[PDB]
Symmetry: C4
Subunit: 223 residues, 4 copies
């Protein structure tokens, strides 16, 4: 436990932490410049090396963190996250993982404590509401089944499939185009379709308000 | 009261209750597979028998529950529900009742106590707001009448009928396409239509917020 | 003050009040049947006489109420209302007043005390918020002027006039079609229009939430 | 400090303040009449001189305020504002500044204390939420980058550029046309696009509710 104390004083360093945060902001700026095709045509090599650099440094960092923290590291969600977001980035382009790499910019939430407080407030609120979520999901499922067989033969895009009915009922819940776009069309064939979707909007768009209030009191009380 | 005590120990059984819940989840999965026309073409018989099985078991269950609970059974809303949702399912396809059968999946709310607490909180909130509901319904009715005769001759789809005006005013209340889709069209013929619908949106979409707050405090206080 | 005590015991009667309420509900049903052109072609005379009857009875009622209550009658808003809604109905069809007659169905709010409590709660909340209203109205006016001259030459339907800009900014505030319908079109000519409407949506749709909370706490505290 | 006390009694005058407010309301009315092309063709000269008058008086006023208040003037935000909104108006039409001149009507908020209380309540709430804002902005940025490269090749108008993806994600957050207008189109090419936008709507449209509650409690508690 001689060298172990040496890398512990490096890992626990105020410089080390600040150095990591400096790269995250740098890489975040860089990942937004990779958006410009103009910029990329002239600096893709400069950037792709910088991308391969920052990921090695982030890999060294994780390995150090593991030696210093041992099994306590995997008890930490913020570290588990940091782990999975460099592992994703470690797998080569051989093609959607190339896009998930930008999730590493969320380390700026992990690495910055002022941010963790907010996320953790929000995430801890959720298990209390897990029961209302299962009510609405059961409610969606019961109605998604009904709508599939109530309107999916004549309206396949919106209701031809359980998942399609799930998606459309979600859209109705957000109220987006629910009447002009969906229910008025359905009423040219099924004049009583409003007996299905008006009760659905009452229940769901009012249960949601409770789910809203509940979540947004627990977080208020915690902080 | 000798055999009565025997079926009471069966009905009140932890196994019995758990056995019923196991079927509900099974049937719920099954009722979602009946959505796939692919799956149905190959397993419709397997499923339709399973449907006829689960409904007999649910019928036996209700009859037992009635012998055990006698008139206390019909004093129980959760049991009245369970009753009406197997009766609906008992009537054959001879054709919308075939769809209402899936309402039996809501027994998963009845059979699971962790769920009843949430529903019952919500339902008990409602009688307090019944007075605001009757205000808005009177408000809709007074304005539905006005709009029918104010714009139903030139705009029959939206306002040609009391019920059509009711439906459109409900759509305006949710604010969906209210201007681009309804009021701007009306203003090509009736340039002052906004004197009707802007006050309607103020009142209704602000009374609704009160109805929202009221309901979503009573439920918060009850729990 | 001999006959005065006689009509006071009639006006203050539980029968009298209940008799008036009976007509309001009757007339309300009748005013909804006048919506059906089918019904009207066969019963217009029956109804139009019934309309002329109920309005005479309502006129007698108001005159009695005035003799009994004298100047206290005009100190009462609920009576002032009842007054103006039979006066409107008194003016003949010689043509929008024919439609405002249905406002008499709001006497069902006046005549029923269980309803007055709710309305009066809401109306008393308003003077406290009158200051935030004047902020938003000043805000609309300042931006309605800007948008008229910022986009009314190339977009006359939405912004060619102060009032047209007022109407469109109100639509943007409700968020209805604000991007697909208005700002994306504007950005084909004015690529920076989003510098105008995104700050406008922030401020207004967030001030509104305060105006919402304020109103919907005062009413909650009053009741 | 002899003449200094003279202009201090003028600046601090109840007449002086009231005289300034009288012009603001006058100019505000006038700036709305400059909207009418009819009115302008006949009274542009009358108005443009009145505009050049009011701005000189407002300039004299600011100079007096500076002599009286010295460095305390620039410590005052309400005065800094008044300063910058006459300076903007001082620069000639030589062309968007011609439109920003109407921002001087906001002096009616500055000059009227009943209004400052409301604005200042709102503005002081904001620094507490500055941390949640930076979360959502980081969240937008991470997703704006993803969407640009996830859909900007086949959907350039909505996602071809970081800023375009920023604008569209803002539109999705307000929920305007999010499904009919954006995600359903995307799903004709990218059938799993809903795996991107449904989680985005959950997080953002629920974090926003917290940002809403937080802001609209601080302001409620302050007042
Ligand atoms: C990890 C945290 C890092 C925080 C982010 C730091 C700031 C990010 C700067 C990177 C901006 C890249 C700008 C850019 O790529 O321009 C592209 C297009 C023109 O493309 P093109 O003409 O094809 O070349 O032109 C545009 O699209 C205009 C660019 C508008 C986007 C700039 C706004 C960035 C806000 C970042 C806020 C994050 C706060 C946490
Ligand atoms: C809960 C999770 C349920 C997941 C689920 O049911 O997946 C089905 C659908 C997507 O399946 P899919 O068949 O791919 O439909 C996609 C639409 N399409 C075909 C046009 C591309 O998934 C959806 O689109 C449903 C999205 C909303 C589910 C929200 C559940 C409400 C709970 C409230 C909190
Ligand atoms: C708890 C809430 C439960 C919600 C149940 C609401 C049911 C809504 C009924 C509905 O949307 O309409 C679907 C069915 C279809 O039958 P139908 O209207 O007869 O379709 C005739 C058109 N044709 C001849 C070409 C097939 O039409 C009906 O069966 C409507 C009868 C009611
Ligand atoms: C009583 C409580 C029971 C709880 C429900 C248990 C889970 C339900 C599983 C049943 C899912 C059936 C999937 C299915 O039918 O696929 C159909 C289509 C393809 O159809 P096709 O190609 O025509 O054959 O492909 C699809 O549409 C994809 C399927 C997406 C829907 C699956 C999401 C189910 C979420 C259930 C959550 C309920 C929580 C209480
Ligand atoms: C309260 C219950 C009032 C029920 C009612 O008035 O029924 C009339 C309409 C539906 O009648 P209907 O004549 O079938 O109109 C359907 C539209 N159509 C013709 C195009 C198929 O029903 C409606 O569509 C009205 C739906 C919303 C009523 C909500 C009342 C607001 C209370 C706020 C809580
Ligand atoms: C409590 C809130 C009560 C709400 C009352 C608001 C009234 C809104 C009036 C409105 O929407 O316009 C409808 C009427 C129709 O008359 P009008 O505008 O003269 O229609 C002329 C078109 N023509 C010749 C082909 C018949 O136009 C008018 O009468 C507008 C006059 C005001
Ligand atoms: C002063 C308070 C009184 C309270 C109101 C009492 C109930 C009102 C009943 C009057 C309903 C009139 C029904 C009607 O006119 O049918 C018209 C159309 C068919 O028209 P058409 O085929 O042309 O003959 O067919 C339809 O549009 C279907 C009718 C749907 C509307 C009926 C819903 C009335 C809800 C009233 C709730 C008010 C609560 C305060
Ligand atoms: C406050 C009262 C302001 C009244 C006002 O400014 O009137 C102007 C406009 C209507 O004037 P108008 O020139 O008739 O425009 C109508 C649209 N058109 C031409 C296509 C038929 O009136 C409007 O359409 C504005 C409606 C919304 C004003 C709401 C003010 C926000 C306060 C938030 C509480
Ligand atoms: C407090 C919030 C104050 C809000 C101020 C936001 C200003 C938004 C500017 C805007 O929407 O664009 C309007 C102007 C019009 O000038 P411009 O973009 O040059 O129009 C050129 C098109 N043409 C040649 C056919 C005339 O374009 C510009 O001036 C944009 C420059 C910034
Ligand atoms: C600094 C605070 C001052 C407060 C504002 C004082 C009131 C403002 C009055 C100025 C109204 C100008 C009316 C006008 O220009 O008419 C234009 C068009 C017809 O144009 P055109 O036919 O082309 O001639 O016709 C119309 O667009 C109808 C006009 C509707 C807008 C009038 C509503 C003004 C509400 C102001 C509320 C501000 C409260 C703080
Ligand atoms: C935060 C400030 C971020 C500013 C920023 O990223 O600027 C990029 C875009 C506008 O850039 P631009 O490239 O001009 O896109 C305009 C759309 N176009 C091309 C069709 C005219 O700006 C936007 O349109 C984004 C507008 C919403 C940003 C809101 C950030 C969410 C925070 C929640 C509080
Ligand atoms: C934290 C939340 C992170 C959100 C990640 C969600 C990812 C959503 C994926 C998505 O929207 O689809 C985009 C990609 C594109 O690949 P792909 O669907 O294969 O496009 C094929 C069309 N083609 C041949 C003409 C190129 O399609 C996929 O890769 C979908 C696979 C999952």
């Amino acid at each position: 436990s001689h060298m172990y104390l040496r890398i512990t004083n490096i890992v626990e360093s105020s410089f080390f932490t600040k150095f990591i945060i400096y790269l995250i902001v740098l890489n975040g700026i860089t990942m937004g410049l990779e958006t410009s095709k103009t910029f990329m045509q002239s600096f893709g090599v400069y950037t792709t090396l910088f991308n391969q650099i920052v990921i090695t440094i982030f890999t060294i960092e994780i390995i150090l963190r593991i030696y210093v923290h041992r099994i306590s590291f995997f008890k930490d969600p913020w570290s588990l996250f940091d782990f999975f977001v460099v592992a994703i980035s470690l797998v080569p382009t051989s093609e959607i993982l190339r896009v998930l790499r930008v999730l590493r910019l969320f380390r700026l939430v992990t690495a910055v404590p002022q941010m963790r407080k907010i996320v953790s407030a929000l995430i801890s609120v959720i298990p209390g509401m897990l029961s209302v979520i299962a009510l609405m999901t059961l409610f969606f499922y019961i109605f998604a089944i009904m709508a599939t067989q109530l309107f999916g033969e004549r309206f396949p895009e919106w209701f031809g499939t359980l998942g399609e009915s799930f998606y459309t009922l979600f859209q109705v819940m957000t109220l987006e185009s629910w009447s002009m776009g969906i229910v008025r069309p359905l009423m040219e064939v099924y004049p009583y379709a409003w007996v299905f979707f008006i009760p659905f909007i009452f229940v769901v768009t009012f249960v949601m308000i409770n789910l809203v209030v509940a979540i947004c009191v627990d977080a208020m009380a915690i902080l």
